[PDB]
Short mmCIF file of C-alpha atoms and ligand atoms in Angstrom, two decimals:
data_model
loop_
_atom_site.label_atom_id
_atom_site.label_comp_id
_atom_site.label_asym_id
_atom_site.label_seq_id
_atom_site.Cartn_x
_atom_site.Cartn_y
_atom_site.Cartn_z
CA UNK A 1 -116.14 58.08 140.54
CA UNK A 2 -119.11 55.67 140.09
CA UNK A 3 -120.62 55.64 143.82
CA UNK A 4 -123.85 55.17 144.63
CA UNK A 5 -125.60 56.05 147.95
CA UNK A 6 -127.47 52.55 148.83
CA UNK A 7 -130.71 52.35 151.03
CA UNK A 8 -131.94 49.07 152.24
CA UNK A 9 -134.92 48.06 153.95
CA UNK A 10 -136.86 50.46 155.84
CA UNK A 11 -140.58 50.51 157.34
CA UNK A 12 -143.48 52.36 156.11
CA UNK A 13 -146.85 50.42 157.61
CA UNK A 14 -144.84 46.99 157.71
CA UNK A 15 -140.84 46.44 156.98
CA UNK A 16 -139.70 46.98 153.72
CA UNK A 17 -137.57 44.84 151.39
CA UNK A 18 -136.83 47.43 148.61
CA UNK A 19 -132.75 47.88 147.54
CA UNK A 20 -132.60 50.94 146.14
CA UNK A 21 -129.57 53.24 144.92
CA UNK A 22 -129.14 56.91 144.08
CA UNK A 23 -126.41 58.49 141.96
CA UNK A 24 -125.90 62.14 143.59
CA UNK A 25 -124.05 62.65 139.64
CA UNK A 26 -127.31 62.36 137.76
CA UNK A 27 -129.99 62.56 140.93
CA UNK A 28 -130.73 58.87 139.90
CA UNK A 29 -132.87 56.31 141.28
CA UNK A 30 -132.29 52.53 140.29
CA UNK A 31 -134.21 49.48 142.22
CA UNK A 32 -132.00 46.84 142.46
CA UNK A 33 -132.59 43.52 144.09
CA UNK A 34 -134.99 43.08 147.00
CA UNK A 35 -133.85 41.63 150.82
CA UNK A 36 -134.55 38.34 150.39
CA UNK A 37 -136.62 38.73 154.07
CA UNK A 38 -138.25 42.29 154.81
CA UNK A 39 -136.23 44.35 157.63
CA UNK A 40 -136.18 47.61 159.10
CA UNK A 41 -134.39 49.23 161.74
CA UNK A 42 -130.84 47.58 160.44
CA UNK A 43 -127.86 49.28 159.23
CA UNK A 44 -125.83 49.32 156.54
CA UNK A 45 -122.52 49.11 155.83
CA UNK A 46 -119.53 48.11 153.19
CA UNK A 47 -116.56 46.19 153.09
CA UNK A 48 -114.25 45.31 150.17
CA UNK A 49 -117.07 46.46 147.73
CA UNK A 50 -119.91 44.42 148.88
CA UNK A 51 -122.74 46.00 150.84
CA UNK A 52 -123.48 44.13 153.94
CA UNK A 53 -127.59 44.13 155.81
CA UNK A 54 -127.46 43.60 159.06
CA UNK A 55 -129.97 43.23 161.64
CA UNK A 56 -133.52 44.56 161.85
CA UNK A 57 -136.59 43.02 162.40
CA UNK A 58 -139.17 41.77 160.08
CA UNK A 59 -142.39 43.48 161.43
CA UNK A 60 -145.79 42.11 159.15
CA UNK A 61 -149.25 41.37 159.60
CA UNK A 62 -148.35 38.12 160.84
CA UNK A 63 -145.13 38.65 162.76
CA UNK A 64 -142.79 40.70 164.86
CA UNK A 65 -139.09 38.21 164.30
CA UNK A 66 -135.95 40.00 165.40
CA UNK A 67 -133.61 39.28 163.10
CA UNK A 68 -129.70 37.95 163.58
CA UNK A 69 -128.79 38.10 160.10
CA UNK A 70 -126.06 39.66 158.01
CA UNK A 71 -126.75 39.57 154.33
CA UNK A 72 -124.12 40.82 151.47
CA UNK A 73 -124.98 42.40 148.21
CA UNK A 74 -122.95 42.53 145.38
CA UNK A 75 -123.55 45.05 143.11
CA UNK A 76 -121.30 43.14 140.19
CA UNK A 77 -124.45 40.29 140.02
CA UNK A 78 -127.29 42.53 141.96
CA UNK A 79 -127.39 39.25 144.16
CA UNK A 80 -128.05 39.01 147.53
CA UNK A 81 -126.49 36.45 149.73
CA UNK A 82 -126.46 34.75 153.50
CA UNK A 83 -123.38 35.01 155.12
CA UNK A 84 -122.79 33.97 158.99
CA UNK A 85 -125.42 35.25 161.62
CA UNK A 86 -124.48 37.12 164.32
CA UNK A 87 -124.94 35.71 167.75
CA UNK A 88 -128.36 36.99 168.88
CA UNK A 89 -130.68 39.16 166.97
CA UNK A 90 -130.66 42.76 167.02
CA UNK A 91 -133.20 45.58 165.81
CA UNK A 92 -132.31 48.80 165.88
CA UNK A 93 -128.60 48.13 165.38
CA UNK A 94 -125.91 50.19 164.45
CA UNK A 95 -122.96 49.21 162.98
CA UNK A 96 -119.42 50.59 161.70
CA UNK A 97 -116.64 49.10 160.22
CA UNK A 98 -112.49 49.22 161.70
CA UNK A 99 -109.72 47.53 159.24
CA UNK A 100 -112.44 45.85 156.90
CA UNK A 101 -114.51 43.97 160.27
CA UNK A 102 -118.00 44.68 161.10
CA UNK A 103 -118.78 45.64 164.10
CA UNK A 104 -122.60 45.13 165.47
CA UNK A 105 -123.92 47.01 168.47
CA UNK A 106 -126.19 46.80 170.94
CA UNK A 107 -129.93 46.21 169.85
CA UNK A 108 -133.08 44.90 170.90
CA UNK A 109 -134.34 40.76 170.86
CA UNK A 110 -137.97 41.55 171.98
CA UNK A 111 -137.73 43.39 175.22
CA UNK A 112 -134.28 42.71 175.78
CA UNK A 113 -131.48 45.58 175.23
CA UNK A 114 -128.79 44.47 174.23
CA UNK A 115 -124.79 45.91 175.17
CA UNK A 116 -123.24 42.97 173.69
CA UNK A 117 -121.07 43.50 170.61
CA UNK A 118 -119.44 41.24 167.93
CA UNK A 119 -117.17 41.42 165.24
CA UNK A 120 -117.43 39.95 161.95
CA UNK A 121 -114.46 38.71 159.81
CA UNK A 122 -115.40 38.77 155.94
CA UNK A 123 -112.62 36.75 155.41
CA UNK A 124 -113.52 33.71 157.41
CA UNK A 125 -117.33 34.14 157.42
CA UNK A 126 -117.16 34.58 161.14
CA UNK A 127 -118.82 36.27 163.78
CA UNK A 128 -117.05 36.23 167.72
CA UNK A 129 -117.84 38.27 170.57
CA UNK A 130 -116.03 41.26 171.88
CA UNK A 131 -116.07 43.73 175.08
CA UNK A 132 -119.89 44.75 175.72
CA UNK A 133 -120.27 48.73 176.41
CA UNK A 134 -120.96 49.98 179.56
CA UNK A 135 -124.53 51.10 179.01
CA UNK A 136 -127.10 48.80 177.34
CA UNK A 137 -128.39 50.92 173.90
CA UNK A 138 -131.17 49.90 170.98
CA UNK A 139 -131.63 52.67 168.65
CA UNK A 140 -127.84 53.05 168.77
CA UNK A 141 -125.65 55.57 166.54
CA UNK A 142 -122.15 54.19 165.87
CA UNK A 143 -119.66 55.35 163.63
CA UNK A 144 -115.89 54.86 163.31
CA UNK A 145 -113.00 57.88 163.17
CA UNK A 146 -109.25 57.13 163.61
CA UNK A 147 -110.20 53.20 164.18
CA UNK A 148 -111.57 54.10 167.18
CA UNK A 149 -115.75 52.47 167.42
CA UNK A 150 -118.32 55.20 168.88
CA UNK A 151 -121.72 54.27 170.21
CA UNK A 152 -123.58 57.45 170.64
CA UNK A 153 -127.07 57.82 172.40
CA UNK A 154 -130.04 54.91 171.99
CA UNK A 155 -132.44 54.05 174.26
CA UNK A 156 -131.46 51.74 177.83
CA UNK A 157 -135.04 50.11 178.28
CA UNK A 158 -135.96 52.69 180.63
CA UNK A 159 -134.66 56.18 179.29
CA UNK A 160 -133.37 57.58 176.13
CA UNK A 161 -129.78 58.61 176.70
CA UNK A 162 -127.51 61.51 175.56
CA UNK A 163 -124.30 59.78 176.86
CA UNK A 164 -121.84 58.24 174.39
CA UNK A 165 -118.91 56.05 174.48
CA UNK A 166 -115.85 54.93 172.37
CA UNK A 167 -114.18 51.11 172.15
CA UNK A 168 -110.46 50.51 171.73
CA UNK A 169 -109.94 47.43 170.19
CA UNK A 170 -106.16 47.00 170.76
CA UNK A 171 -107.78 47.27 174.28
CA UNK A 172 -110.91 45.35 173.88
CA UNK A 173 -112.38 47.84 176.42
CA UNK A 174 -115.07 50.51 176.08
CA UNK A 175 -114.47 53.91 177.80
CA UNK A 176 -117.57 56.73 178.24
CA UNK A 177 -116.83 60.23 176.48
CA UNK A 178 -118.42 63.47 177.15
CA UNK A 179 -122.67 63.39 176.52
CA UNK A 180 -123.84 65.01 173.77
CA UNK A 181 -125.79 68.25 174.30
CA UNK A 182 -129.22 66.55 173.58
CA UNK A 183 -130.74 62.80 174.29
CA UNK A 184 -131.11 61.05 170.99
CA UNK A 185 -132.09 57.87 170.30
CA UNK A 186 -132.55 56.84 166.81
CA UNK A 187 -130.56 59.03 165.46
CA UNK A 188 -128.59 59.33 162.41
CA UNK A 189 -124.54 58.99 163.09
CA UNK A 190 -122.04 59.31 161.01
CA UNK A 191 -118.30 60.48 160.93
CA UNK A 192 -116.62 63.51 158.41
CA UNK A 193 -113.56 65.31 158.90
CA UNK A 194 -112.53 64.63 162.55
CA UNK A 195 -116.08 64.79 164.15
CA UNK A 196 -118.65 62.32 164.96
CA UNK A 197 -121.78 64.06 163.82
CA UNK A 198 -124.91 63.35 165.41
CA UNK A 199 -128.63 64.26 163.70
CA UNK A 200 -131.80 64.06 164.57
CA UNK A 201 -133.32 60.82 166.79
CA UNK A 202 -136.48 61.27 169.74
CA UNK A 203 -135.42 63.13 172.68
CA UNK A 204 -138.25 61.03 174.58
CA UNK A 205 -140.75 64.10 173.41
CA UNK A 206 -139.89 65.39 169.81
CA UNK A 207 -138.38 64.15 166.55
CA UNK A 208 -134.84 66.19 166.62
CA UNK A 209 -134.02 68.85 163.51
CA UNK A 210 -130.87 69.66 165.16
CA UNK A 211 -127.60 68.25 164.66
CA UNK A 212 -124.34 68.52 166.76
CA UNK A 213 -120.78 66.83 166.32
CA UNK A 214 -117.84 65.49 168.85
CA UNK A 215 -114.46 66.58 167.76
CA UNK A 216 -112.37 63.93 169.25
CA UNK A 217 -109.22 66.25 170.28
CA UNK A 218 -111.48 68.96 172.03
CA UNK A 219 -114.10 66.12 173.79
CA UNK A 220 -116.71 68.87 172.80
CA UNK A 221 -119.97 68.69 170.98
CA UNK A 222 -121.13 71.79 169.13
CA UNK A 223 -124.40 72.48 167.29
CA UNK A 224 -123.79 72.80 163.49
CA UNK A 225 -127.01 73.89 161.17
CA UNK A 226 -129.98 71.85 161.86
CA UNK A 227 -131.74 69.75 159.00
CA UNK A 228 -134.97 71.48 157.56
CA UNK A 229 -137.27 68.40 158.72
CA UNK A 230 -137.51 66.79 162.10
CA UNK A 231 -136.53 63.14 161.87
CA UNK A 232 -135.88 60.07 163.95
CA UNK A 233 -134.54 56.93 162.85
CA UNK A 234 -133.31 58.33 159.49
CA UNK A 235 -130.51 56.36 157.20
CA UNK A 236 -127.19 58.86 156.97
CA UNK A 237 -124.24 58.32 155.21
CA UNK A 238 -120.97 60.51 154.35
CA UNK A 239 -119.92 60.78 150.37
CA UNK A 240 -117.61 63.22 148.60
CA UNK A 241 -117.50 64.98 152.07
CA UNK A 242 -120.88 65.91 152.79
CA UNK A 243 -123.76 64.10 154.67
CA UNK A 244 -126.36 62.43 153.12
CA UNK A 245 -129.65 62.10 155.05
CA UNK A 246 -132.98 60.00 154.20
CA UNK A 247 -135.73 59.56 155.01
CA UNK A 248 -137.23 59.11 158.95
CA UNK A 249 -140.02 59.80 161.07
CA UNK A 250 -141.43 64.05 161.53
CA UNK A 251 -143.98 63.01 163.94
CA UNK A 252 -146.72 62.85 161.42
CA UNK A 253 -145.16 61.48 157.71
CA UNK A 254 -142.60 58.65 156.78
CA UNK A 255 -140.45 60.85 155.14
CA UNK A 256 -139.20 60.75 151.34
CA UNK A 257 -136.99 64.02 151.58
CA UNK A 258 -132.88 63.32 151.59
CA UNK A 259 -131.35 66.54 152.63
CA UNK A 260 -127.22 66.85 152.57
CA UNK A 261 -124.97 69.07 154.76
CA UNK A 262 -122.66 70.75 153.39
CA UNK A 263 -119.51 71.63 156.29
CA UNK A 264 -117.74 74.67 154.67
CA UNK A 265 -121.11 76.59 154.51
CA UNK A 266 -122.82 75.03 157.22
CA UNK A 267 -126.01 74.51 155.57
CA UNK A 268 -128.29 71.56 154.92
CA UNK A 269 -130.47 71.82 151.00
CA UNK A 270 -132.63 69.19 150.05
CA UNK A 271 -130.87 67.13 146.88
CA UNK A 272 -133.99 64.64 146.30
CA UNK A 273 -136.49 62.47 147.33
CA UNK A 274 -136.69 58.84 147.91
CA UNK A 275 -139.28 56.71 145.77
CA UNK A 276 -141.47 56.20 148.89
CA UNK A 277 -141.27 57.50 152.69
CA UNK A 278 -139.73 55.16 154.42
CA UNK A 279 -138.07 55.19 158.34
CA UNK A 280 -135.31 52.81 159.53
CA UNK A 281 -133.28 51.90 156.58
CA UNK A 282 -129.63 51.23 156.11
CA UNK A 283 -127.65 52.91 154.05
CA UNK A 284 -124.01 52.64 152.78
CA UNK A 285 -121.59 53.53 149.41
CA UNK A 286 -120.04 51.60 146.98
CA UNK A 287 -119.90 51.12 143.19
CA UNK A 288 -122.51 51.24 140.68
CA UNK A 289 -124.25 47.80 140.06
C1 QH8 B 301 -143.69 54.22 167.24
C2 QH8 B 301 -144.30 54.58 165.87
C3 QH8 B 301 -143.82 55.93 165.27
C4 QH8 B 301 -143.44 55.95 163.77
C5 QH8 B 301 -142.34 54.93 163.40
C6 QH8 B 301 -140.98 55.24 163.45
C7 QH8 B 301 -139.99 54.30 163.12
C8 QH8 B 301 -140.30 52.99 162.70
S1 QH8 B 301 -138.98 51.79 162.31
O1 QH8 B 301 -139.62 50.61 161.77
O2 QH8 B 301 -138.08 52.42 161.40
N1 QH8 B 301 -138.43 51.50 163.89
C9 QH8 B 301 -139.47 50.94 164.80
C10 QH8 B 301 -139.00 49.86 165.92
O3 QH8 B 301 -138.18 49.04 165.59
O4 QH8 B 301 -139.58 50.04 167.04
C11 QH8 B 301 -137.20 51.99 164.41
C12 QH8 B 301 -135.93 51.72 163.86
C13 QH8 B 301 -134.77 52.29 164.41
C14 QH8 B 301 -134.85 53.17 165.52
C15 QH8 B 301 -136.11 53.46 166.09
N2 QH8 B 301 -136.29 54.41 167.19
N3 QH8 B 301 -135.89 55.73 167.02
C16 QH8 B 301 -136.19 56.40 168.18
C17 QH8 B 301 -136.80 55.49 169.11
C18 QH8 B 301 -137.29 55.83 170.54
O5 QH8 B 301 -138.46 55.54 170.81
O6 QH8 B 301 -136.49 56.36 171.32
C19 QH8 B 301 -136.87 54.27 168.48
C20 QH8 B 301 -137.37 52.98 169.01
C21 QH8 B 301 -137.22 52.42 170.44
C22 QH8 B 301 -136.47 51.80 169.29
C23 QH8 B 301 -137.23 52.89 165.49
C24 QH8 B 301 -141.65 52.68 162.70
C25 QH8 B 301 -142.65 53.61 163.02
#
């Protein structure tokens, strides 16, 4: 009990600094501490109880600055903190988390893309390199099932991609698994049960409703339901065993709707909105503040 779903950042007209948490008990909205610099197209992630920001880019009036930053929140104080930056900066980053380290993939440092990852150590404040995939990826979903690190579509530089791959850390080596059905980039990625779900993203023509998932003893991806709104890079997130999404870009609104699927019916309902439309936040769980 006592879980919030946390959103961080986000962009709507410039990036957004706003921490904001809903309680899916009460259908709650608190705003809690802002970034202490504006980011969107991070993720989001916890570890031990703190919430960790990573990545982004600060896009304003007066600047475009990548950012290499990871940033912990801790909902005991509602304080924000620095910890250790990563080793290059990376916008549209995804992240997951194996055995309480952060992983950070792939991203963009202006017209670089990036398919250099590293792993951070809460422990020791530390960030080191490990194996770089096999396909360079910004707008990157990654998620983690069976401590096993998936990097699922994104964009190369050149096309928007539908091929995926997993890393095995005992390993340190990165290993391509079947493509998904559709090219996403931007999507929203997430793990629940024994699939990797994939939702939404830009299949290089539309903002994606639909919604497939890799179950990792088949090597298939099936459809499932797809969400009621179109969306590309939307913040997901898995709690009390159904997906959470929010927010995103339809092609014509910053969205405020947060729908949740539901796996036993298959269906996707709309369970609030967000105080603003918003596109390219993080978003993670933990305790109350
Ligand atoms: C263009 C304007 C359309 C409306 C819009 C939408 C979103 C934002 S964002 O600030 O959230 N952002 C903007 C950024 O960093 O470029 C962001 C963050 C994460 C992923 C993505 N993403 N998803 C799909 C694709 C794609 O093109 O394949 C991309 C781009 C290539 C990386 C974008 C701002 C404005």
């Amino acid at each position: 009990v006592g879980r919030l779903i946390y959103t961080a950042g986000g962009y709507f007209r410039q990036s957004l600094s706003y921490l904001e948490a809903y309680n899916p008990s009460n259908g709650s909205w608190l705003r809690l501490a802002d970034l202490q610099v504006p980011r969107s197209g991070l993720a989001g992630c916890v570890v031990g109880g703190l919430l960790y920001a990573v990545g982004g880019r600060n896009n304003s009036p007066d600047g475009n600055t990548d950012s290499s930053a990871l940033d912990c929140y801790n909902p005991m104080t509602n304080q924000w903190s620095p910890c250790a930056s990563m080793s290059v900066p990376r916008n549209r980053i995804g992240v997951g988390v194996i055995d309480g380290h952060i992983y950070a993939v792939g991203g963009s440092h202006g017209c670089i893309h990036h398919s250099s990852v590293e792993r951070y150590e809460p422990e020791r404040d530390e960030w080191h390199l490990v194996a770089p995939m096999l396909t360079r990826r910004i707008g990157v979903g990654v998620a983690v099932l069976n401590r096993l690190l998936y990097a699922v579509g994104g964009f190369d530089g050149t096309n928007r991609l539908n091929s995926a791959e997993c890393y095995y850390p005992e390993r340190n080596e990165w290993r391509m698994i079947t493509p998904m059905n559709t090219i996403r980039s931007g999507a929203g990625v997430c793990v629940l049960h024994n699939c990797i779900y994939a939702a939404g993203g830009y299949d290089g023509q539309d903002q994606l409703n639909s919604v497939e998932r890799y179950d990792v003893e088949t090597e298939t991806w099936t459809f499932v339901a797809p969400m009621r709104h179109h969306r590309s890079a939307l913040g997901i997130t898995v709690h009390q065993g159904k997906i959470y999404v929010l927010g995103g870009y339809d092609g014509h609104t910053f969205l405020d709707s947060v729908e949740c699927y539901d796996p036993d019916s298959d269906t996707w309902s709309e369970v609030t909105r967000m105080t603003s439309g918003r596109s390219g936040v993080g978003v993670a769980v933990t305790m109350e503040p």
